[PDB]
Write a protein that binds this ligand. Structure first.
Ligand SMILES: [Zn+2]
Length: 260
């Protein structure tokens, strides 16, 4: 199997590995990449993986050690890909699985590695990469269209996970409650967010399923601000050939459900 650190990385891997090998995901649904320790059974999967795929040590630091022990031919470290370095945005935001362009680079790297590891599967791997890129292009056209009328509407997200996606599709967030969703915002920060929401005529605040939404709801009350929910880890999406496109589509729907 290809073992992916986080579900959306698993989504990309599962487009490319479909009908070639299985894809497994380390981080369970409901858990957060900002607050995780590997289980003994997580450590097992890694040593036995045909290929490991992760963002890198500035993201999933809990994986750096066992990953450093593997051969280079048995890993893809997304944030260190030569194609990815030029695309990193300000040091750098590591929420890379939400960048369609980084997703392509990641697909390419996975394809290359699997072609080496599994030469019998070259044709299917080639076809998979082809299909992935076609589907992604359609998805980007669709998502761009869905989000176009929402450009300029201000909102707050719970944590700073969405930058690549927002930049690609022209969404205009006013800010985030937290950088690390592990760190409690503080009351001062919370009334300041509300002032900004009210003053700058924001339309939404967004909770996330991995974190209790109490604080998001508290900031909204009194105001005209609607509450939505964004899931940066695609919990409700099953791994599979079309999962990545489904993920980007669902995220777009989550923004639109509130912002429209
Ligand atoms: Zn995050």
């Amino acid at each position: 199997a290809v073992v992916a650190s986080l579900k959306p990385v698993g989504f990309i891997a599962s487009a490319i590995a479909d009908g070639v090998t299985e894809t497994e995901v380390l981080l369970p649904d409901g858990a957060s990449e900002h607050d995780y320790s590997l289980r003994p059974s997580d450590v097992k999967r890694l040593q036995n993986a045909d290929l490991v795929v992760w963002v890198g040590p500035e993201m999933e630091a809990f994986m750096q050690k066992p990953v450093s022990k593997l051969p280079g031919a048995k890993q893809v470290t997304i944030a260190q890909l030569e194609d990815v370095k030029p695309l990193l945005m300000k040091d750098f935001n590591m929420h890379l699985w939400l960048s369609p362009e980084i997703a392509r680079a990641t697909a390419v790297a996975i394809h290359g590695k699997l072609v080496e590891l599994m030469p019998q599967s070259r044709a299917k791997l080639d076809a998979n990469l082809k299909d992935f890129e076609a589907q992604l292009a359609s998805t980007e056209t669709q998502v761009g269209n869905e989000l176009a009328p929402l450009k300029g509407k201000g909102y707050f997200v719970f944590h700073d996970a969405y930058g690549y996606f927002e930049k690609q599709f022209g969404l205009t967030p006013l800010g985030h409650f937290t950088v690390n969703p592990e760190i409690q915002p503080g009351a001062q920060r919370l009334h300041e967010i509300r002032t900004q929401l009210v003053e700058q005529k924001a339309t939404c605040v967004f909770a996330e399923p991995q974190f209790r939404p109490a604080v998001v709801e508290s900031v909204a009350r009194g105001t005209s601000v609607r509450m939505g929910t964004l899931d940066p880890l695609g919990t409700n999406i099953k791994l599979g050939k079309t999962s990545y496109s489904e993920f980007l589509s669902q995220l777009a729907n989550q923004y639109a459900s509130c912002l429209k």
